Amino acid sequence: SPKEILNLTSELLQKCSSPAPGPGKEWEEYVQIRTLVEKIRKKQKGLSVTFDGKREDYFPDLMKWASENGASVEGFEMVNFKEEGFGLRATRDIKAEELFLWVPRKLLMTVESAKNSVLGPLYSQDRILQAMGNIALAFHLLCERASPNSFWQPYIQTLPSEYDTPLYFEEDEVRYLQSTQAIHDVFSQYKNTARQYAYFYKVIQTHPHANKLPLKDSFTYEDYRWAVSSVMTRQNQIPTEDGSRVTLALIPLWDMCNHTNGLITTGYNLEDDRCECVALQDFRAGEQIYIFYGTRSNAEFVIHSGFFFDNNSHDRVKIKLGVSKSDRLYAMKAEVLARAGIPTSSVFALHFTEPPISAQLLAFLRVFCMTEEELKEHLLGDSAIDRIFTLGNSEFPVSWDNEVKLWTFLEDRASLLLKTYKTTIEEDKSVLKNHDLSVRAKMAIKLRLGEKEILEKAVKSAAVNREYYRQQMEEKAPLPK
């Protein structure tokens, strides 16, 4: 059994180190990797370390541990919520902008504390750990979890034992995402995680020696999946003590806050060396205390945070666009885009808000649909730089005809993109209504629906904009300046 598990990880390492198979064969590669991962996992014991009892029983010790090291423990409590898991509930009234949470650096798990832990020797020898603080944090977490005397034991014992990152999805749950934008990042996550587990399994088991490292006795695929999901769903960038650079960190107590829409109200206080959080809004006693995680898309929330957020006002989808070298106006268009600080081709974002395109995308699309005479006006003479200056401003168009052309293109390309999906918007909504699905399956289906709904909104915006400028073209309205 011990050599057999080593042979399997060596095959897993080879498979997951191979170049990308091509987009048409990524699903096949994914199922091949799952098969090998699943065979390793059935031959292993699960998590190397587990803890008795229910998750609620450990939160009192987390609070006592935080209070004895200077953290705030007044005004809130840990409660199991129906829609978010566990989180903070105010035990008193909390007014907006009130400082209610602070966590000194001594409580944090950071790349620096990892370097100074039992992981230190391996970290100093391994070029991957030195390059990837997120992976180092994951191993920091595993090493301390396996250390009964660890200072961070009260925090590690309150972490979830399972997550809703795609690493935990069944194959048929990932299958819902076929033909979506998001599934490629799911494939990458799965292949990254498997390559890393196999790489470090061979480093730990094979490479001298039998260090004080607790991972030498037991390092399972379950261990690594749990550790990277803990880090990716909870990690944070903070300054170092010197304030000279940034590091990755796990922030106990405060990272139990669940997410809602709003603005970031959590910041690092370097002089007093502690994390600080002020109330996003008024929280009456008994209400859940929320924070704003960040302006991430639902693809990012699903893949890296393990949840889908309804009414995420920052949801977006990628759109790839570029001036082809086949265009006879390529040189002029590329020069205009260069002067505006835009590459000749890039990945842009379509947003589910109004307007759905950014200033950068609007500037690119304007150049994309520009005549040669219009491009010359953006290249030559005393007004050329000023015309570039307003290229991304919806109030100052190049011409009525230019607006109609660019909005026609966006309408057409978004409509084309809707037709590359396996299901329609209406069929997804009927799957979600008429069927009873797992939480993870609903996440996959709502994500593929969300992509199409964002494209659908772009079609409607572009159609309206098209008609607006086209009717103003017919009336020959004076162009603004």
Binding site: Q189, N236, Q237, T266, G267, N269, Y293, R296
Partner: peptide, 15 residues
């Protein structure tokens, strides 16, 4: 804005 804003679960490259 905050000098050192903290983003819960900030996204990082894992390759």
């Amino acid at each position: 804005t905050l000098k050192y804003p903290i983003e819960h679960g900030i996204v990082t490259n894992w390759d």
